[model samples]
Target: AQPRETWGKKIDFLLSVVGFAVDLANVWRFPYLCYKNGGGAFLIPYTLFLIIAGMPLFYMELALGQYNREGAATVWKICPFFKGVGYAVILIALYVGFYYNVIIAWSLYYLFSSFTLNLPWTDCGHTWNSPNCTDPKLLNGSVLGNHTKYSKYKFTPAAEFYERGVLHLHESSGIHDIGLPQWQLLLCLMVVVIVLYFSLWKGVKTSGKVVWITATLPYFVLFVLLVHGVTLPGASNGINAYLHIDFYRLKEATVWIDAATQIFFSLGAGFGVLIAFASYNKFDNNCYRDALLTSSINCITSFVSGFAIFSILGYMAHEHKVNIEDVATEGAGLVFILYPEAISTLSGSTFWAVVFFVMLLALGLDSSMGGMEAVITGLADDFQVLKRHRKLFTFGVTFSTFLLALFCITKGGIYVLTLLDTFAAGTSILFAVLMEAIGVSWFYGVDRFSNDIQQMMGFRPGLYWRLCWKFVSPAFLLFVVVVSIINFKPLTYDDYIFPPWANWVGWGIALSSMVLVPIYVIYKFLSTQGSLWERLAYGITPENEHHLVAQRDIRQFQLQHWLAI
Candidate 1:
């Protein structure tokens, strides 16, 4: 028997999974990448790899979670010995969870600030706007007073407000001196914590209901933004820039490499949320359909949002008389500066302002929900004590995360967020995917796993899925890993170079995660009575609790309804 808690409806599970996987990065990163890699040509590898890599992993995670009915850590009942892989997943999620909330806090800050009639990043005179930060709006409007040294191009007020007003960035003296936490941001952090806890404290009951709104609403807003963007002056230039792929670039390994990884990143394959969300599903839930639809939704969402993002970016480039590339930025900064600045030039700035940040806030909240569930649920699974005190556990995790997030709320916090984002989420992603693909396909046996899904869905997965699972996915991932190793670049945030020690520390963060796999296997071997092969046999064998049982008597008894359509 597994857990008693489940989604209120099939749609609930679908939306929660979709909500978690399709994140802010889809809107921010995809357009920039498409523009960079080769316009529409990038879509060739992207769409092709979506099945080769993304769907295989996507379908596997949902099936694994529903079948094992376990958290990321506990799901390794499929291979009990290498349970460390599960732990690594949970640990990575925990680390990511902290930074994830910090982002939410930042979103809240911008959302609140957006309520003002004139968006603050629009002007050059704010106290937080840097003296050197050039507003492109005012560019070449006057002769240079100090033409000798200051003749080079500089910041847009949008960029200045982010670095100055929002982050209050300082020189990287290292990650240690975080400076004092900003009280305003700390307050926003508190609000986010409270909101997340409340949304998830009842486990899936409340959050599941919440996803009905949070998951589907971003699409509506994004579509509106898309319509708004296409009408902008020079929107065609941006769209043209996005679609102009260099076929020659396809021969370069990096283009394909990037396309593959973006599919994984955007699909939320290695992120652990799919498993966590699916674990809550009722035994008979048809996740095959969910996986296909949700994966499609995620990819489509990323693709559509690109037009909305780049059309505006092209308009910005048109206004500034620069290349669209010059106007583009990625990640949080892209949404913050580009969208806000572009919208501010529109007839009703505040309307676009509210819609944009609200979309971001919804994305942030949906993202936080997944991480919080992973942290709360993973720990609860490892320690039964937490399961018994569900409310207490939820609050404890949320409060502790808020405390950790204060570091990211400081004036120097962006540096910290940047560092964590790099070290915490990068190579570690491929590692987690490798472990999952091997663990599920090879160790557990893909054929039998297909049978397991068949039991739930009343139909078997087709040959294509099995082929991807048994061969293509892992081989392609191995190629990615080898290339990543061969061409590993030292971590840096833009022009800020890290010293040797800082680079080591970043590597250490990644090591700390993967090290769990071997350490844990040895410990597992020591506990059970057997030599290596025998131990492997014992580890793969399911124990008594792994048996199927009465539907209501699942593992968590702790916490359902089924919805059709």
Candidate 2:
């Protein structure tokens, strides 16, 4: 009862957590996912899974942490045998916390450069620009008669700037060949770590203040861009391309699979962020409404921000007389390359670039802080000894993560980021989520979970929610996991295929999350004393919060106490 910390207001929690949930992924990834899938019709699969999988899963996690009131790692005191689920989620966050700042460093590089009267990425004669660099917007007062000559290889100032300038990239080696760190990115990386240190130094006391600006600032930038993008030369055409739906694409299983991946990632279902933040809620708070509100905000932001982005992408395509597919791409291509150069055609290119890169910086900062906080809070929860040293721990984590991040900021760092991005978070999350659902719904029992919710909220969850937590959500997750395994593809970026050992490392990451379950089960079986059935039963038996105070008074201390899961 003596231990706990919380946001200044319920709204502070919303802003802080929402800042993470609606992030860069929404900016670059979701809009493009909608276009790549069936456009308008893609909503069908997205909404279906959102209801069957996303919302219920969100509600389940929100309830779990709010009711238990513990840190992320300790939240799994129930079914200690599967507590590794929390550990797995924290592992994901730990990897994400460090690597993600590299993207912010890239954003900072762009934001500062945007102050220049002319953007560096748009100038063909610059050292980084290849001989083939051409700007379709810069011909003799027309979009045509551009690309006057051709060679076997092609270049865009934007692409080359991202490659040769920002990343200092070289070819053909794998993770083992990680060379020296690029000086510019290294400086940017240090600034990012310092900013993170200050933001989270006081836990939510400082972070909660930071999110008011960081979390809410991106939308203003988005609206400003959308207002400008729509009036630009090719804006309407780009919107059309973005909104164009191919009903035929709906017939393919891949489309639905893509939708599931989008929902899982977009809603941040597998990550412990929801639970981590939820643990700080007012103890008797009705989190059911909060779950729905959080999910809605994330989805709505993703869908609306698509317009602000793709309209500019379409304008760039029109400038070149090319199809939308010719210009539209995803990941770093859209972010560091295409979009920055696309905006170079704007009348106030420098100003808008300033606004856009600032937006990216804020978005990246919010999400990065969320990942780091989860690790910090989770660690404090798992070891009682560390609770007092949280500040020391934060500084330590921030420093170590920065050093690990230097590998990415190196000449070969981009490749390392690619490998880690693909393996560490992407492939491993589904299995982590699958194990999480089974652990709660089967091992801990949905009926009991619902009863606990009723104790706090005065009503049991609806029948639909019960069914979802117990059956629908887990079943759908299992199907996605199976399909992902069946359709597993090797690591390839453009024409470069990673080495065989690289592929093995990717699978090793996936198994690392999966292996936790059985490994824990074995540990419990051998070490826990009993016959087979008794040991099995004992292993699944949950270890809950221990308190001498009554439940009613414990909750009443919500304003004062902090929980370590």
Candidate 3:
């Protein structure tokens, strides 16, 4: 017997998938990138791609899921030879699931750290302070401006009495600087593992319950942070600096690549994870509209988060008596190193600290869960083992993934995470997704597929969506992928260097993902006794025949109900 048709209700599925993809990366990474790249100028390309690349691909994922009504691998088998793409997505998700939880652990650590009224990193007076520091400003400025040429600044004991402004540093009178304890980090990591363990322990039912806290609470926290941040002195400077238009910088080829990459990361494209989640939906669910709404909401939320994030940066700038550009750092640098010290100076620092870390936790948890479910679902579908023992399969996948995650926690784990982000999802996923889109839209006929959506949605899609599906999205994405591959840069930071093999390491990771396609194609070739045409023709038929029939029935029922009403 096949697996059950739907995992949960349509609304639950929508929230889970959307909540997972729409996360802290948007709040932290997106805002900083927008500021660093071109501010308002970035929006031009960003919004354009959102329409052509983001929303269209999002809708395509939903349509494919509804059409297949099965796990990602099963969905790919519709095209027989392209089954490897599905396998690649599943493997990448599983690989990501392991290390991504480490970030959640960091959030948990900070959440607990928030309770300490006297924040670490705020005061330069602790034992950890460098011997050259006699004043707090010198210590704070030197430490905050790590790797920069300017290490010394005027420090006054009385200057610490000023109100903690947006970017101000707190002064400590003690001889040693306080720091996050090792035990605290360990405890936080354990808690994250436990939360994930229990969440997936019972599968989707248990995981679904977490959406209430992990999904909804972050927005409230964001608003609170924004309210506090904007009111601080020098806040406007930070906001203005972040939003300043720089059209000259926009001309860089890398700027466009970054914008496209941000959209992919922000919108959670190319993972095949969305398709897996949507596969659990009833065919009659209006996924096309849902995808559109979700994509729009995601972009709007990123804009909103810019205000919230920059407000804090503005506050930090005010406190430090420096420009926002001096304080701003993108990606992990902003969250781990910069924000911690910034938040340490606030009045009622504990409350703000808890809120900030909780927000991070929410974002990380939501994103990781979706990836986890996709891998689980894909493996179950491919192997056909979940049908016999669902619990064992779930436990086995979770256990194996957790073991792999331990490798990511080693001393070299951060390096591994950097490599994964740069290579696997960053570069390779886009290439794979573009191919998948071309395979579906051009080869499989998106026009015929749109009919299935119309039947389910009860209204014809707009011409924009139709055109995007048929032409604009695939073409734009193909160009972006090509440019990204040609211009791919190896990782570098400070004086620490990777071996010659490091460049190949990045390619190897990317190739590992692509390797899935050929493996699956071979499997299909052998299974079908080398009948290529027969295999390609098979792509037209729905993989989950029962769900397709059920969808038609559900649409008719919904239509009848609307008539009666």
Candidate 4:
């Protein structure tokens, strides 16, 4: 057996997990979802899904990886047929990284741009500014009277700066019109890739030290912003709008669906990250407590972050003399477009702008590190060749992701980013987790998994956990997937609808990772030299449990295997 290193300390491990789970989505997406889906009433369904599905899966992955002490792919020794699920998640994480680092680079660009006496996006006379770019100061009482009027016919200084200056989107008409990558973005991305390579090249040893700041800095910034926001003119209105309970919205299926998907993506359950991070813990490190503690922090951080977000949104609405809904949005628009605009209106605008972008860089770097770590650890453990030359291997992975990320920094790159965002980790991730839940709970046997946990933590999972693992969790994923597919709509950006063929291309990107599962299953079936029943027996048997296929036991074939716990 090979020697494995443990985290430097317990706090390091905890911070690593917290840093990864509390990502950019926690800052932007969750707050928008809370406001959109019945506000206070949204917590009902979100908490329901979190308990029944989210935490259980989160705990299961940590326990499984901790007990097995293997990467995602190799951990599939418990059920060889499902090894492809490991590969699928690893690829999904990598695919996400391809576009995600570009967002961080954008934040870095903004940070560098903020070092001036005047923030670049605050004025309208820049070369990148179009004739329609209207400064908020220029929008006096007449323009503010009709909120949607100017938004439809004219563009804000911030909007023009982001679209025409940062993204250069005006030159490209659509996805097909992607021009050459901009040198500014490419330089920022190179800095991001270099930082990632150095931080992660040595594995958790270096990355753990890095997280002490990357993970915790955002909280300090958020608190500072939240304290400042409450003093703003429209802050109360924004907070009220965010917390307003529209109980009637709960009657809509979309509320429930959005809640389920939000919890799933928010905790980041299916990304192979939880498993990989837990794999480095000490064998008896009490991961059960870590699981509950870290997951709760992730959710609570999301709830608290909503206050910081909405308080500022209210200020933006107040300053603009417009309804909060006019400025309410999610994803990059909220962060890059709306937020920077609001920061520009305050005193000490340069300091606020710098603080805001630094917070973004911190938030983004931590999550991006987690995504890349999953891929790096998952593959390095499965292949000894990679483990031996980790520094070089790290460079290869970072550079390759950088190469793919180039596609997203071009004139029409936002279109590509949107396409990858929609398909790369959407329903495909749900499907992967569905298969993972079934593989461990059904095929590998819940009782056996419970025994593994008991051996590590000195207690068996209770009846509730057994029931969730064996039944409810799998059903949760199934329902989410079924509803997600049923509700699928063609992709669009603002008013631009994706062509029919682009939808097919997106599906191809989604299925490329998903198809790995069945492909590996068929490969295992054909490669085994046995009768149909014998092959079935071989596939479900754990090599780790028996130590060899030749010594595969018959316990898997017994009736109690299915009936037990």
Total backbone collisions for each predicted model: 2, 7, 17, 0
Write down the lDDT of every candidate, Cα atoms only. 0.76, 0.76, 0.67, 0.84
Per-residue accuracy of model 1 over 1-565 as CA lDDT, tens digit each: 3446877688888888888888888988888777778878888888888877767778888888889887888888756766788788777777777777777777777788878876777776754455452333443244323322111123656666666666666432546676888887888888888988889888888988899999999999988988878877888898888888677775667678888878877777776678888888888887777888888888888888888888888887786566677667778877776667777777888888887788888998998898778767777887778888999988988888888877788877876777777777877777888978876777667776888888878889888888788788888888888887788787676556666776687678888877878788778877876456555455654454334331223322221101100
* Model 3 Cα shift for residue 424 (angstroms): 1.1
- Highest TM-score model number: 4
TM-scores for candidates 1 onward, in order: 0.91, 0.91, 0.84, 0.96
- Over 4 Å off, model 2: 127-154, 171-176, 544-565
Model 4 error, position 294 (Å): 1.3
Order the candidate numbers by lDDT, best to worst.
Answer: 4, 2, 1, 3
TM-score ranking from best to worst?
A: 4, 2, 1, 3
Query: Which regions of candidate 3 deviate over 4 angstroms?
Result: 1-9, 124-187, 247-254, 530-565
What would the per-residue lDDT of candidate 3 be over residues 1-565, giving only the tens digit for each residue?
Answer: 7556475666667677767767778877888788777877888777876677677788888888876777777676445556777878787777677668767876775565457767654564542322224435643445455444211122322122121111122322111222222343345556766677678666677767788677778778878878888778888888887788878774757477678778887888767678887887777888877888888878877887888778777877777666677666666556655666667666777777777887888889888878877887777777776745766776677677656655344434555556666777765677668768866765555655667677777886677776777678778777877887787666763334555576687788787677667766666556653255444344433444324443433222243322321
Alpha-carbon RMSD to native, per candidate: 6.5, 6.0, 8.3, 2.0
Better of 1 and 4 by TM-score: 4
Error of 1 at 367 (Å): 1.0
Winner on lDDT between 3 and 4 is: 4
Off by over 4 Å in 1: 1-3, 127-154, 171-176, 531-533, 544-565
Cα misplacement distance, residue 541 of candidate 3 (Å): 6.6
